[PDB]
Design a protein around this nucleic acid. Structure first.
Length: 78
RNA sequence: AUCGCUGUGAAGAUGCAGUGUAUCCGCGGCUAGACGGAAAGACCCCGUGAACCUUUACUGUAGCUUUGCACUGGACUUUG
């Protein structure tokens, strides 16, 4: 009932329509820009933007290549 | 035009019967009667009357409480 927009969910995919609970669509996914309710009004707009899904979702895992190298330094003085 | 007694009588009589007493009218007192006056008896009964209190009367309800379904999600584990 929703199109996903992130591939790091524990039971999610790239852009697959999944039918989920109403609270999970309502309260978490839609206010955080990671899913949108699968409506039958703009479906021909999704197929003319399928090459937009590759760039940011490849760059996200590519930015964590050098992001995790500064978290495990253990230089925080309590 | 309002006596006493004895009877009689819705059964305790100024008014009925019989019979005694008694000229007409105040004033001051006293309360024995007028089943005196005051209150459509309070007790008792009755009303398929009422009111309010009680409870283990009947029937319900406020409140308190149990679970289901919503609001209400993901993730693991035990499990049919």
């Amino acid at each position: 009932e929703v199109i996903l927009l992130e591939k790091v969910a524990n039971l999610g995919n790239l852009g697959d329509k999944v039918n989920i609970k109403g609270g999970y669509a309502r309260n978490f996914l839609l206010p955080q820009g990671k899913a949108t309710v699968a409506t039958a009004e703009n479906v021909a707009a999704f197929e003319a933007r399928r090459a937009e899904l590759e760039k940011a979702a490849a760059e996200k895992k590519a930015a964590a290549e050098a992001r995790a190298a500064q978290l495990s330094e253990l230089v925080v003085t309590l």
